[PDB]
Amino acid sequence: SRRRVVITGMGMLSPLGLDVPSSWEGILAGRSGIAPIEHMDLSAYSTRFGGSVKGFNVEEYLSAKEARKLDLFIQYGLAASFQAVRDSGLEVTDANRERIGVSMGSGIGGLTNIENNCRSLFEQGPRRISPFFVPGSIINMVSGFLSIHLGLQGPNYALTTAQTTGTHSIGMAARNIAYGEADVMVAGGSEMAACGLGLGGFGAARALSTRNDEPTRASRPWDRDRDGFVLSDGSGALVLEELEHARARGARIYAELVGFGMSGDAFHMTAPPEDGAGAARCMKNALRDAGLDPRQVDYINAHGTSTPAGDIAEIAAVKSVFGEHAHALSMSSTKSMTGHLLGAAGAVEAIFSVLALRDQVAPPTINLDNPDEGCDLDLVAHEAKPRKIDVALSNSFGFGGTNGTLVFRRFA
Amino acid sequence: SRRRVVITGMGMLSPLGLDVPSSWEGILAGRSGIAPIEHMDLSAYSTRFGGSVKGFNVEEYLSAKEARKLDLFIQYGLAASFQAVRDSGLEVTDANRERIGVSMGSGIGGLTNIENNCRSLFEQGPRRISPFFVPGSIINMVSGFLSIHLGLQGPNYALTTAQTTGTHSIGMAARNIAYGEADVMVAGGSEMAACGLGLGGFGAARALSTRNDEPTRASRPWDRDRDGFVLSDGSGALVLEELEHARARGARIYAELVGFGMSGDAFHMTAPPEDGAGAARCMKNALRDAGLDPRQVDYINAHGTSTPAGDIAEIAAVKSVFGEHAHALSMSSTKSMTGHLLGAAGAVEAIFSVLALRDQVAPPTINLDNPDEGCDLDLVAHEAKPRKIDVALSNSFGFGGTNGTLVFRRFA
Ligand SMILES: CNc1ccccc1S(C)(=O)=O
């Protein structure tokens, strides 16, 4: 058998706020974090907007010297991790440090640092490249730097599954705990691809909404006028903890992580299949993992990227998995407000899923003024919806057809 | 409840060969794959050699049309995965495709591709960035593209844990199978970091051997005259399979994967602790996972990177874990010949560890002319050593203090 896993700590940077409570306040009020990108020449760019982290003060976490060594994506992940550990009340000791590990991931990693060192390399040659270039840019350094700062000696690793990273990181962190390899994990993702290469890279595949005139209306999941996703920056981190360990120290328990599903589409490199057959296997895999019937599910935090193919596949997948219960559950895209944090999407959407359990409220899908063909589900258009939520799903479907589902249940 | 996991297929690109048997012949013959780099101009670089893959034909595997869109690390990963799958004899069907997944990882991923696109952006503008920049560079697309070409709908993901990536990728794929999420996984890693930023960033950190006038003698693990690691390119892939599923189809079984350990040093971003404390915790986790007496270990494929700190830390970790039996087992670093394939190091060295079991031979540490202070173990100096091997161990240690150990034994 298997150990139960609870959420005792959460931390976040998002386009809505510099922590969980501020972010969640924006989500429930349907506020957008999307705005034209600043201190950056986007003249030659079809997209000039996204969700930036506004007002981040790294010196709340690190000395200036330590922050100078680390890509913004690493900074954002340490921030959410430090918040989550502090939010949990956990005390690390010689007696438990071998049982506390970290799995913080990223989709794309250190593009901002890769750019600035590229500038150096091309202008002046190799001897101007930072000595800290490699360890300050690679994706396993949020786990690395966190483990070194707090003295964590348990499982130490990093996932990179594109837009599925956050969901995969939390899910496989839960497995470490359930099968007795750890009592505590910090898990989630961080991302800062709002650079030239990120905007350019996604710009060149014309993946991005180009609604420059109305940045707050660009992200419109399931709306007939959607024209691709909105690039956003940030981090989410959860403290996952074995239930008996959490109870023994009297932890505040937000919710229980009951299920994790994974699937591969084996379809296309960036597009999901029109019927969402891969997202459907993943959700069924996640429900079976939790020993739950589809009928027991109340809330889904969609991937809901605002791409023509993605949004429609997810409707197909939900109708397929949930049959005559598909209208009864509420499903919303918090990306209507946050845009798409890529590797960190799944981490902040796990937190929104946990807070939907705490607060008994479905976050809105904003900008859903004209549901597309067959988008006739309860997508919680425009405003938040109080309702009963025992069981909440969080879905992520990424490049390479990599799928993740997390199942959270109310704990009392 | 926990199932057993065997190896039924292996695949490789190394500086010694374009497959396993060719690579392994070089290993047993003590041949160096290290040579001055020809694919770029390094006269401005303090290090000008590495373990290049020689004469790779991507069109043994993929269309030139697809190949052109993919960073070499992805081409190298697919090449290794296709070999391993072929070598397995496995036929993907509707009956088994949901039960076959992939976990192929990388330390750094498509730096070459990110660099070249960066050069396009800075010299020409954002409009010259490939539309294939993101899907052709990000680390999870080895898992993604393999799943699409072969129709694998099992768990689909990628680790990035720096120089531990290969060992972790293989260990965790075994856990997928062990605990019922899959019956088959293609697992390992791939790296092509030999670009300006790669050789530049490792150079800026003074991590690399600067023995430009004798590259075949650069990599000399435990030798008193070692001066840093040698940067190499390539890929390893293994087909991991549930034992009864392997029996059920009359699979040829190279060996059984009985043990996997992880730990964190929680010490330093790039430096290992001189006492090998985190490495010791990791091997002990692995031996306890395998239910072994540490005296059962016959062969250790060491991380053996040829850095001053790394090499001596490993000796300490192995004396601390094995006590007097540390003087009975054989330990060698095939990095003496291949150099350090970073995130692929663990994947090719897992294969060397399995072939050590098949052939009953300890591969040599070449260039070990003058063992350093305290390096008094059986390090298989100079020449392969025929000997009884029932249990083989493969260690990796990375930036962020992240440790991985795999335990193989003969299967009958
Ligand atoms: C028991 N561990 C397990 C089980 C299923 C999937 C993944 C893992 S992992 C990567 O954490 O090793």
Q: Which residue has the tokens 């063909």?
A: A373
Closest CA to A160 of A193, A185, A133: A193
Is B400's Cβ below 8 Å from some Cβ in A?
yes
B141 and B275 inside one domain: no
Tokens at residue B51, please? 């373990």
From CA A356, how far away is CA A235, in angstroms rounded?
19
**B157 CB near ligand 1 (under 6 Å):** no
Is A302 near ligand 1, meaning CB less than 6 Å away?
no
User: Which of A119, A158, A278 is the closest to B122 by Cβ?
Assistant: A119
Nearest CB neighbour to B203, from listed A126, A132, A155: A126
B65 in a structural domain: yes
Find residues 56-85 of chain B whose CB sits inside 8 Å of chain A. Answer: none
Count of H-run helices and E-run strands, chain B: 12, 14
List, in sequence order, every residue forming a beta bridge with B48; answer none if it has no partner: none
A254 plus A266 within the same structural domain: no
B344's CB contacts (< 8 A; 6+ apart) are: B76, B106, B165, B166, B188, B189, B190, B191, B234, B235, B236
Report the residue of B118, B206, B399 to disrupt the A interface, i.e. the one with the largest count of A CBs within 10 Å: B118
- What residues of chain A lie within 8 A of the CB of B130, using their CB? 204
B1 falls within a domain: no
Q: Do B190 and B310 share a domain, yes or no? A: no
B74, B139: one domain: yes
Residue type at position B277: A
CB-based contact B155 A262, cutoff 8 Å? yes
Which of A259, A280, A297 is a domain's end point? Answer: A259
Helices marked H in B163-294 — which ranges? 165-178, 196-204, 243-248, 277-290
Separation of B173 CA from ligand 1 center, angstroms? 8
DSSP A8: E
Inside any domain, residue B367? yes
Query: Residue B364 is which amino acid?
Result: P
Interface contact A201-B401, CB threshold 8 A: no
Report CB contact under 8 Å: B111, A114: yes
Q: Position B232: which residue type?
A: S
Instruction: Return the half-sphere exposure (C-beta side, CA atoms, 13 A cut-off) of residue B49.
Output: 21
- For ligand 1, the distance from its centroid to the CA atom of residue A159, given in whole angstroms, is 12
Q: Does residue A382 contact residue A48 with C-beta atoms inside 8 Å?
A: no
d(Cα B74, Cα B61) in Å, to the nearest integer?
12
Torsional class of A323: left (φ above 0), alpha (ψ -120 to 50), beta (otherwise) = left
Beta strands in A182-245 (DSSP E): 184-191, 234-242
Documented resolution in Å: 2.1
Report the separation in Å between the CA atom of B177 and the middle of ligand 1, taken as the mean of its atom positions: 9
Distance CA A322, CA A395 (A): 14
Whether residue A348 contacts residue A12, with contact meaning beta carbons closer than 8 Å, is answered with yes
CB of A360 less than 8 A from some CB of B: no
Ligand 1, atom nearest to B181 Cα: 5
Spatial separation of the C-alpha atoms in residues B106 and A264, rounded to whole Å: 19
Answer whether B114 sits within 8 Å of A119, measured CB to CB: no
- Compare CB distances from B138 to A44, A118, A399 and report the shortest one's residue: A399
Q: Do B114 and A114 count as a contact with CB atoms less than 8 A apart?
A: yes
Which of B157, B210, B307 should be substituted to probe chain A, the one whose Cβ sees the most A Cβ atoms within 10 Å? B157
**CA atoms within a 13 Å half-sphere pointing along the CA-CB vector of A195:** 22
C-alpha span between A50 and A37 (Å, rounded): 6
A151 touches chain B (CB under 8 A): yes
Question: B125-128: long-range contacts at Cβ-Cβ below 8 A with a sequence spacing of 24 or more?
Answer: B125/A44, B126/A44, B126/A45, B126/A196, B126/A199, B126/A200, B126/A203, B126/A204, B127/A44, B127/A204
Residue A230 CA to residue A47 CA, distance in Å, equals 9
List of chain B residues whose C-beta atoms are within 8 Å of the C-beta of residue A268 = 148
Of B320, B345, B392, nearest to B221 by C-alpha is B345
Residue B189 lies in a domain: yes
Question: Which of these, A24, A87, A16, lies nearest to A354 by C-alpha position?
Answer: A24
Q: Sign of the CA dihedral B231, B237, B243, B246? A: negative
- The closest alpha carbon to B253, from B263, B242, B261, belongs to B242
| Interchain CB distance below 8 Å, B269 and A179 | no
The pair of structure tokens assigned to B142 is 């080895």
Number of domains in chain A: 2
Please report which helix (H) or strand (E) contains residue A156, including its range: strand A156-157
What is the C-alpha separation between A118 and A39, in angstroms, rounded? 19
Say whether residue A92 is in contact with chain B using an 8 A CB cutoff. Answer: no
SS3 state at B104: strand
> Which residues in chain B touch residue A119, judged by CB atoms under 8 angstroms apart?
122
Mutate to test the pocket of ligand 1, among B3, B99, B175, B289 (most ligand atoms within 8 A of CB): B175
Q: Hey, is the C-beta of A205 within 8 angstroms of any chain B C-beta?
A: yes
Same domain, A357 and A410: yes
A306: region left, alpha or beta (phi > 0 left; psi from -120 to 50 alpha): left
* Residue A271 at interface with chain B, using a CB cutoff of 8 Å: no
* Chain B residues closer than 8 Å to A185 by CB: none
State how far the alpha carbon of A92 is from the alpha carbons of A155, A184, B10, in Å. 15, 10, 41
Nearest Cα of chain A lies from the Cα of B386 at a distance, in angstroms, of: 35
Are A184 and A304 in a shared domain?
A: no
Residue B362 in contact with residue B353, Cβ under 8 Å?
no
Tell me how far the alpha carbon of residue A251 lies from the centroid of ligand 1, in angstroms: 25
Q: What single-letter amino acid sits at A395?
A: N
CA distance to partner chain B, nearest, from residue A89 (Å): 20
Query: Exposed/middle/buried for B289, CB within 10 Å: 0-12, 13-18, 19+?
Result: buried
B133 with B186, same domain: the answer is yes
* Closest to A188 measured CA to CA, from A331, A334, A9, A359: A9
Query: Is the distance from the beta carbon of residue B5 to the nearest atom of ligand 1 less than 6 Å?
Result: no
| Chain A closest-CA separation from residue B111 CA (Å) | 8
Query: In Å, how far are A184, A297, A407 from A290, measured between CA atoms?
Result: 20, 11, 7
A2 lines ligand 1 (CB under 6 A): no
A179 lines ligand 1 (CB under 6 A): yes
Q: Is the Cβ–Cβ distance between B200 and A121 less than 8 Å?
A: yes
| Domain, as residue range, for A314 | 260-412
Same domain, A288 and A201: no
CA distance B381 to chain A (A): 32
Q: B169 CB under 6 A from ligand 1?
A: no
Task: Based on the fold, state whether residues A240 and A271 are members of the same structural domain.
Answer: no
Query: Residues in chain B, how many?
Result: 412
DSSP lists the bridge partners of residue B259 as B407
Instruction: Judge whether A1 lies within some domain.
Output: no
Asked if residues A136 and A71 have their Cβ atoms less than 8 Å apart, the reply is yes
- A178 Cα nearest atom in ligand 1: 1
Query: Is the CB of residue B207 below 6 angstroms from any atom belonging to ligand 1?
Result: no
Q: How far is CA B179 from the centre of its chain?
A: 24
Q: Are residues B19 and B86 in the same domain?
A: yes
3-class DSSP state of A23: helix
- Alpha carbon of B47: minimum distance to chain A alpha carbons (Å): 11
As beta bridge partners, residue A260 has A406
Considering the domain architecture, whether residues A99 and A171 belong to the same structural domain is answered as yes
Phi, psi of B137 (to 5 degrees): -120, -40
Does residue B243 sit at the A interface (CB-CB below 8 Å)?
Answer: no
Angstrom CA distances, A312 to A224, A273, B84, B153, stand at 10, 10, 36, 21
What does the alpha-carbon distance between residue B252 and residue A289 come to, in Å, rounded to a whole number?
Answer: 32
Residues A250 and A294 in one domain: no
The last residue of one of the domains, among B234, B259, B284, is B259
For A269, the closest of B148, B155, B175 (CB atoms) is: B148
What is the Å distance from ligand 1's center to B73 Cα? 25
What sections of A193-328 are H helices per DSSP? Answer: 196-204, 215-218, 243-248, 277-289, 308-322
In a domain, B411, yes or no: yes
Does residue A199 sit within a domain? Answer: yes
Chain A residues inside the 8 Å CB shell of B159:
157-160
Task: Give the angle subtended at the CA of B304 by the CAs of B299 and B307, to the nearest 5°.
Answer: 160
Give A324: exposed, middle or buried? Use CB within 10 Å, 0-12, 13-18, 19+.
Answer: exposed
Cα–Cα nearest to B300, from B232, B370, B352 = B352
Classify B89 as helix, strand or coil: coil
Q: Is the CB of B126 less than 8 angstroms away from the CB of A266?
A: no
Q: Is residue A184 part of a domain?
A: yes
**Domain termination residue (choose one: B243, B259, B275):** B259
Residue A203, judged by CB atoms within 10 A of its CB (0-12, 13-18, 19+), counts as buried
What stretch of H or E contains A144?
helix A141-150
